[PDB]
């Protein structure tokens, strides 16, 4: 602190209050716009409806094709290009099936080779995709 007066507590508190708004983490957590733009709305997981499967081209040097799914929510109606987590799992997903979509772990930032996707699929048709890969569960058909 610069001012060191014996009764400058309201000056020091106002400076710390104002300079907190210049912090990226404080302004994100204390503004309605950050929560408005979030499709989850503070939710850890959400259910959505598959309307199409979208292939996403990769970034600089590492080049491949990433398998994604355009997920449309039920609680908000917004559309999310969610990423299919593991290898060979797009054969598991079908059209017009409800999916449990969460984040991937970077908390609102595009992850690695995939451009513009922050979301991954956990459960499909109330059946876990991890057990589908392991063969522990079979899709009801």
Partner 1 sequence: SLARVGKVRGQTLKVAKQEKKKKRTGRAKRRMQYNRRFVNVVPTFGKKKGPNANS
Q: Which stretches of the chain bind partner 1, using CB under 8 A?
A: 53, 55, 65, 67, 87-91
Residues 6+ apart with CB under 8 A from 56: 65, 66, 67, 68, 81, 83, 114, 115, 117
Name the residue among 121, 87, 88, 116 with its Cα closest to residue 102.
Answer: 121
Site for RNA contains 32 (CB under 7 A) = yes
Are 82 and 48 contacting, i.e. CB atoms less than 8 angstroms apart? yes
Q: How far is the CB of 64 from RNA (least distance, A)?
A: 3
Please tell me what DSSP assigns to residue 10. H
Q: How many binding residues for RNA (CB under 7 A)?
A: 37
| Residue 47 binds which entry of RNA, partner 1, none, CB below 5-8 Å type-dependent | RNA
Site for RNA contains 19 (CB under 7 A) = no
Site for RNA contains 18 (CB under 7 A) = no
Site for RNA contains 113 (CB under 7 A) = yes
Q: Which helix (H) or strand (E) holds 46?
A: strand 45-57
Q: Report the length, in residues, of the chain.
A: 141
Q: How far is the CB of 70 from partner 1 (least distance, A)?
A: 12
- Three-state DSSP at 20 gives helix
73 or 82, CB closer to partner 1?
A: 82
Q: Between 59 and 78, how does the x/- string for binding to RNA read (CB under 7 A)?
A: --xxxxxxx-----xxx---
| Residue 53 binds which entry of RNA, partner 1, none, CB below 5-8 Å type-dependent | partner 1
């Amino acid at each position: 602190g610069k001012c060191r007066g014996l009764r400058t507590a309201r000056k020091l508190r106002s400076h710390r209050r104002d300079q907190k708004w210049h912090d990226k983490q404080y302004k994100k957590a204390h503004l309605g716009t950050a929560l408005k733009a979030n499709p989850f709305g503070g939710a850890s997981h959400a259910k959505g409806i598959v309307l199409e499967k979208v292939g996403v081209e990769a970034k600089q040097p590492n080049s491949a094709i990433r398998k994604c799914v355009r997920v449309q929510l039920i609680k908000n109606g917004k559309k999310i290009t969610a990423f299919v987590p593991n290898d060979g799992c797009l054969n598991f997903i079908e059209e017009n099936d409800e999916v449990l979509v969460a984040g991937f772990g970077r908390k609102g930032h595009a992850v690695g080779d995939i451009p513009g996707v922050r979301f991954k699929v956990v459960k499909v048709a109330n059946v876990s995709l991890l057990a589908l890969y392991k063969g522990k569960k079979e899709r009801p058909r």
